Paper text:
The mutations in R7 and R7-2 (Phe77Ile, Phe229Ser, Ile102Phe) result in further optimization of activation energy. By R7 and R7-2, configuration C (which was the only state we saw associated with product in the crystal structures) becomes the dominant substate sampled, with configurations A and B sampled only rarely.
Computational design of [name] involved construction of a theozyme to catalyze the chemical reaction, which was then grafted into the scaffold of imidazole glycerol phosphate synthase (HisF) from Thermotoga maritima. Catalytically essential residues from the initial design include a base (Glu101) that facilitates C−H bond cleavage, an H-bond donor (Lys222) to stabilize the phenoxide intermediate, and a π-stacking residue (Trp50), which was designed to stabilize the transition state and favor substrate binding through interactions with the aromatic ring of the substrate. This initial [name] design (Round 1; R1) catalyzes the cleavage of 5-nitrobenzisoxazole, with 103-fold rate acceleration over the noncatalyzed reaction and a turnover rate (kcat) of 0.018 s−1.
Author numbering: 2 to 250
The structure:
């Protein structure tokens, strides 16, 4: 029940895409060091999202998960182009606490059930990328480019039914913006599911996290707004505690 503050790291070839601004780090593009630093200053969970599109993708993610598991103690999620049970299984066995699937879940929802059947629902995260299209929230796959024709309200119900443990709700209408999380979309989904809802996309300032939790989010995920140091994780948690939000300090 404590509200969660999650940091996500976008990776290509084992490197943090666009780096960070933590001058104090030995390598500002090293996902292991950046992740360990975040765990020290009080991030609650970490996401490693791989956009590597090469024949080396699978082998790279597994070696990264090995290193991260040794040095980092907080929950680790890994995602990005995980397409089948075998890939998911190896990542979990190598040390990932949770695997995140999106396009493969939409195309083959049985995959949700296969993963949860062996590892439990707690190990399955479904990232849902959604966007308003002609007055309706619709689900998008392939890095947000494919309108599947599936309604968000239908897919949320099916994801829980299939056995996912939590849903990351990413508003494509907030991609790259700094104007706030999509609280209308969070409020839309909240009554439809009892699963943990993770808000993603749009965070630009500390008050946006308060808004997301008042909307019913169980966690808030951000990336560049942390890496750029626009928002300090410690200052964010003290702000949220100050204003009545249950965060782990």
């Amino acid at each position: 029940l404590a509200k969660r503050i999650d940091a996500a790291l976008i990776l290509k070839d084992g490197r943090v895409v666009k780096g960070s601004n933590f001058e104090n780090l030995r390598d500002s593009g090293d996902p292991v060091e950046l992740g360990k630093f975040y765990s020290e200053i009080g991030i609650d969970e970490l996401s490693f999202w791989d956009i590597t599109a090469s024949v080396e993708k699978r082998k790279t993610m597994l070696e990264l998960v090995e290193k991260v598991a040794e040095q980092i103690d907080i929950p680790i999620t890994v995602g990005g182009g995980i397409y089948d049970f075998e890939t998911a299984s190896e990542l979990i066995l190598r040390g990932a606490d949770k695997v995140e699937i999106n396009t493969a879940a939409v195309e083959n929802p049985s995959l949700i059930t296969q993963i949860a059947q062996t590892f439990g629902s707690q190990a399955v995260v479904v990232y849902i990328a959604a966007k308003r299209v002609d007055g309706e929230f619709m689900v998008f796959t392939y890095s947000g480019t494919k309108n599947t024709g599936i309604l968000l309200r239908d897919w949320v119900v099916e994801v829980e039914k299939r056995g996912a443990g939590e849903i990351v709700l990413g508003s494509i209408d907030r991609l790259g913006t700094k104007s706030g999380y999509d609280t209308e979309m969070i409020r839309f989904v909240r009554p439809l599911t009892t699963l943990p809802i993770i808000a993603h996309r749009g965070a630009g300032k500390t008050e946006h996290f308060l808004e997301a939790f008042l909307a019913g989010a169980d966690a808030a995920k951000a990336d560049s707004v942390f890496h750029s140091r626009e928002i300090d994780v410690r200052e964010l948690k003290e702000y949220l505690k100050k204003h009545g939000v249950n965060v782990r300090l």
